[PDB]
Design an enzyme around this catalytic site. Structure first.
Site, mmCIF file in Angstrom:
data_model
loop_
_atom_site.group_PDB
_atom_site.id
_atom_site.type_symbol
_atom_site.label_atom_id
_atom_site.label_comp_id
_atom_site.label_asym_id
_atom_site.label_seq_id
_atom_site.Cartn_x
_atom_site.Cartn_y
_atom_site.Cartn_z
ATOM 1 C CD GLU A 127 -2.621 -1.188 2.557
ATOM 2 O OE1 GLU A 127 -3.777 -1.634 2.570
ATOM 3 O OE2 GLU A 127 -1.953 -0.882 3.606
ATOM 4 C CG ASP A 128 3.013 4.420 2.516
ATOM 5 O OD1 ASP A 128 3.467 5.132 1.589
ATOM 6 O OD2 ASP A 128 3.196 4.772 3.699
ATOM 7 N N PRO A 129 4.860 1.756 0.005
ATOM 8 C CG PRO A 129 5.303 1.246 -2.228
ATOM 9 C CD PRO A 129 4.318 1.924 -1.348
#
Length: 357
Positions: free
Chosen positions: A76-78
């Site tokens: 989702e949010d590397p």
């Protein structure tokens, strides 16, 4: 955009497997990541159950639930790795997450440490403010955790503060990233893969330059403990004999490391370190419960090498080769203890084995 926490509501294998499918069908997992999760689940489950651990079912469900939650979070949010990355321990303790995840895969009962007392000597040098580099072989993407777990009882300082030189897949693949977030790192693209995509080589160099400048800055401050595998990759079995030995070192990477340590204006040391754990998570996917080995041995004298060789180029190769030969001596002792079934009987005058757990 908020993090989806569905994996934490899972209470069974069926719900865990359905959650993967449900997240995939909702478009939140690329097909390759969803497949990798299934593979990870099945392989980890089998290895822990295969181990005989009385609490296998609980351990698998628990560890896999958290792992999948944390992998999904990275999709989702590397996370973006800074040149020098400090292990994240709050508000979610990624170090402990990784320790707990790997612990059931190590057969401590059949695992061995060579020359324990030397790790204490390594701590005393760091207490004095010196820098210490562990010149090691590398066998699995889980090496840092395996090193840390084998030393967690006797040498917690090393287990938590070692800075691993690492890069490439482990810092890019969301299946691996949650593990890496919980470790201290100097992020470096391996020479081995530098040319895999030529269009990206310059970008990699630039990144490695930043990381290496940062590493030199850290060494100038003293008390740094760094792990590096100068082969630049994981060991592989001999194509003919099928036997596993440490991969040859890049003598230039070794020399660079020695020079940085020499020009840091701080007393420094390079110790040869051997690790045996390929069976647990072998390079080309596969996970197994197996004993592991870790050993260190005394520093090689560069001066002595320089005094007994004829020119600069021969001195540099001889110094790298002396470190390699120590790693390979130690690795053979670990091999003899574990797959050779000799246990402590594998000990030699150079490598005293123990099981301090």
């Amino acid at each position: 955009a908020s993090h989806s926490r569905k994996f934490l509501d899972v209470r069974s294998e069926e719900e865990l497997l359905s959650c993967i499918k449900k997240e995939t069908e909702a478009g939140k997992l690329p097909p390759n990541v969803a497949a990798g999760m299934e593979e990870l689940y099945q392989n980890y489950r089998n290895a822990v159950i295969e181990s005989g651990n009385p609490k296998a079912d609980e351990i698998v469900l628990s560890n896999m639930t958290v792992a999948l939650d944390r992998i999904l979070l990275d999709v989702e949010d590397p996370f973006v790795f800074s040149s020098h990355h400090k292990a994240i321990r709050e508000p979610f303790d990624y170090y402990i997450f990784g320790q707990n995840y790997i612990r059931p895969l190590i057969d401590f009962g059949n695992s061995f440490v060579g020359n324990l007392s030397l790790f204490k000597d390594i701590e005393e040098k760091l207490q004095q403010g010196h820098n210490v580099v562990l010149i090691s072989n590398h066998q699995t993407e889980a090496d840092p955790a395996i090193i840390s777990l084998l030393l967690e009882k006797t040498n917690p300082y090393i287990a938590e503060n070692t800075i691993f030189v690492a890069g490439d897949r482990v810092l890019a693949d969301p299946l691996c990233k949650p593990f890496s977030i919980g470790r201290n790192l100097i992020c470096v693209y391996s020479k081995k893969h530098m040319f895999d995509i030529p269009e990206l080589t310059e970008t990699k160099r630039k990144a490695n330059t930043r990381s290496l400048k940062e590493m030199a800055l850290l060494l100038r401050g003293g008390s740094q403990l760094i792990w590096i595998a100068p082969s630049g990759g994981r060991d592989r079995p001999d194509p003919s004999t099928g036997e596993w030995y440490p991969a040859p070192f890049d003598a230039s990477s070794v020399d660079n490391m020695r020079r940085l340590i020499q020009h840091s204006d701080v007393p420094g040391h390079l110790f040869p370190l051997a690790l045996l754990c390929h069976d647990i998570m072998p390079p080309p996917r596969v996970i197994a419960f197996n004993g592991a080995g870790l050993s260190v041995a005394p520093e090689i004298s560069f001066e002595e090498i320089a005094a007994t060789h004829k020119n600069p180029e021969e001195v540099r190769e001889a110094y790298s080769k002396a470190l390699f030969d120590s790693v390979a001596m130690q690795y053979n002792v670990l091999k003899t203890a574990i797959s050779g079934k000799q246990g402590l009987g594998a000990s030699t005058a150079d490598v005293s084995l123990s099981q301090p757990w």
